[PDB]
Amino acid sequence: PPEDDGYRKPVQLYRHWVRPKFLQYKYMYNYRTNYYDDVIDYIDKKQTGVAREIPRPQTWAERVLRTRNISGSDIDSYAPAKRDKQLIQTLAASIRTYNYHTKAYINQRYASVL
């Protein structure tokens, strides 16, 4: 249908007025920063003396995983809690190991006949 179209039509909707700016959206900024993050990281830690291999180019999915690694990890990090809670009862059992002990074996007699 849009073959004999030429241009993309003049201005419309003059009287009502629409189109507030909507100037910024977050993930677009994330993508823009993503396209340069690896190279800027490489260079600015290069002046610090720490070494890294060449910034191999990354694909879009690779870029998104990179972004999640640099952003999702920062916003989502709750590793320590359940581990120590689970270790709590193991330690409690470790104290509880007394259980009156005693009896046992390889412990009998006093004879010196060898």
Residue numbers in the entry: 69 to 182
From the paper:
Studies of the flightin amino acid sequences from many species identified a highly conserved domain in the middle of the sequence, residues W85-R131 in Drosophila, dubbed the “WYR” domain due to its enrichment in tryptophan, tyrosine, and arginine. Application of the structure prediction program AlphaFold to the Drosophila flightin sequence produced a structure for the WYR domain that was an excellent fit to the central density. The WYR domain-predicted structure consists of a pair of α-helices connected by a loop. The orientation of the predicted WYR domain structure identifies the V-shaped density as coming from the sequence on its N-terminal side and the inner extended density as coming from the C-terminal side of the flightin sequence. To obtain the final model, we removed the N-terminal residues P69-K95 from the AlphaFold model and rebuilt them de novo in COOT. In addition, the residues G140-L182 were also rebuilt de novo to fit the density. The atomic model begins at residue P69 leaving 68 N-terminal residues disordered. The myosin mutation E1554K prevents incorporation of flightin into Drosophila flight muscle thick filaments. The Drosophila flightin atomic model places flightin residue R87 in position to form a salt bridge with E1554. The second region of interaction contains a salt bridge between myosin residue E1557 with flightin loop-1 residue R124.
